[PDB]
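Sample 1 of the test manifest.
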Amino acid sequence: TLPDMDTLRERLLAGDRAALARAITLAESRRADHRAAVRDLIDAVLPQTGRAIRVGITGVPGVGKSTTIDALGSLLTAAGHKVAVLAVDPSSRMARLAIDRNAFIRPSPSSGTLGGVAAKTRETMLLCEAAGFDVILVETVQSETAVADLTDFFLVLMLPGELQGIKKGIFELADMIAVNKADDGDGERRASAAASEYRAALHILTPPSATWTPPVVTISGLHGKGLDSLWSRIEDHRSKLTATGEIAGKRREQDVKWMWALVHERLHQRLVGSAEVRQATAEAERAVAGGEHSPAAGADAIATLIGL
Amino acid sequence: TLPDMDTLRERLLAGDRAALARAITLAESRRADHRAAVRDLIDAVLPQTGRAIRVGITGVPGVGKSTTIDALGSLLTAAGHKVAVLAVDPSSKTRMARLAIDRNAFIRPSPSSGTLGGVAAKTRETMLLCEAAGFDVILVETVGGQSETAVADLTDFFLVLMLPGAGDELQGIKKGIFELADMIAVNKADDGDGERRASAAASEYRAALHILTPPSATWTPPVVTISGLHGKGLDSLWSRIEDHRSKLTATGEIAGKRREQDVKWMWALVHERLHQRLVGSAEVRQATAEAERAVAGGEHSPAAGADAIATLIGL
Ligand SMILES: Nc1nc2c(ncn2[C@@H]2O[C@H](COP(=O)(O)OP(=O)(O)O)[C@@H](O)[C@H]2O)c(=O)[nH]1
Ligand SMILES: Nc1nc2c(ncn2[C@@H]2O[C@H](COP(=O)(O)OP(=O)(O)O)[C@@H](O)[C@H]2O)c(=O)[nH]1
């Protein structure tokens, strides 16, 4: 009734890409035993995970994120890395990387809650690491904090110059800002001028006791400029924060966060699993949003629905 | 032992602080029917809530937050406001000693709960009680955890207090918190050297905010200097908070933020109820700890831990 998960596990650990893809396919099937088998497989290969650089990447639409990931991912595969690109979308391109046999690109997983989407992304990351991927890029497509809380290093891409340049509260979380579109000629001057502004703000906000002082750099994703320097900074961070234990410390905190997120996703699934409860939950939420009932009145109405 | 909740409600709505205190005191009771009765009373006076300015206040230990709230709260009661000061401690007066004897102020420590979500959500409930009792200024302060974001998500206006310099080489404020500020106030701007060092620091924070704030924002956060201890700059500080209220009331943004916050604290309480079931017997509390430890220690995957926990209570 179930597939041969022992043999799938062995093939995956031996680097068989078909096995990695199949494990991810089984995790998104409608059968609960398929999903449980892949859960059990991930748990079984946990000791072979973690040996990767996990980089989160965000930026406003049009900044050049797809292009930059495509270019950076190709630079890394050329250099002997195996690169996974995982998207995170609460609503749940890269064409050259898409044909690269050492890259593995996946869209955002489906879940009831953004916590669930993000936590499923952690589980996919672990699968990828067990399968031998040593670079995990997680991109936003809210999702920004989730992606920072999924990765070791948070890279924010910015335009080289009346809206938010990036969502309020996200700039200060950057481990590096890369100002994109530093194209030959004036593009370089402009982006470098913009980098000087972001660099002033970020260094005002960075205490000298911080282990890592976030750099601000200029790049051209389109023309492949500045990407080696960018990556070298991520590797420097890995070395420095591995030395302090701060990468382990952050991962432990993230993993507990995603565990609780999945417990909350299980709760959410119980609340939308039947029409009555789904409607009653909606009504309570509407009453609170509308100022008709207090937040605790809505909460207790919902908690009683499922005997909590 | 069951109080007359209909008469308690009537007195509270009339401004009686004793009824207000009794209601908050019944809310922290270890009896579920007391707490339920207070939950019900809040839900019943909801139409009399909301007519206040809600200000969250944070800053590093020793910045002068107690002193500034004591001074600001006194300024406001002097001007005819009734001011409530509510603390949020993630791990749950004499400071604020002058405001503590003020008949038009009401100070309460942080409520206790199993989760920070719970503490914050109970603080929202207390805020509603205070508003119903006629408090028109609600100051919510961080103490002790992730209390800063919680306090920002409890209030209309987020005030961050800063020291007049960063020579201790530490975070001047939690990473992540700065850009959330609706105003930065650099405290200890005492006549003479203090105010010079405060003005210098202010210029730096103002530059960073100038860079980060887009021109489309309804509100551009100011950076000001104050002395909570000597009562300098507090009128100007409050006038800025009133300007923000007027401006974001016109755009519907205060209502919008409040709606989002209320739904957040609703879910936080649902999650607290879940937490209560998981720590409610020694056996399940320990099994939940073991799961959490296994995940923290990289012994089992987050989903393995989660499903172990969910199965403990038949989820
Ligand atoms: N001139 C220039 N254009 C770029 C660069 N990177 C991306 N773009 C362009 O910006 C547009 C948006 O890029 P895309 O990668 O889709 O942005 P995303 O929405 O951030 O994923 C496309 O026309 C890209 O070719 C760059 O370094 N220089
Ligand atoms: N010189 C000066 N000292 C202040 C000022 N505000 C607070 N303080 C002092 O700083 C210390 C900490 O103040 P407190 O209000 O307890 O700080 P909290 O820990 O942020 O609540 C106390 O000794 C205060 O008297 C101020 O405006 N000027």
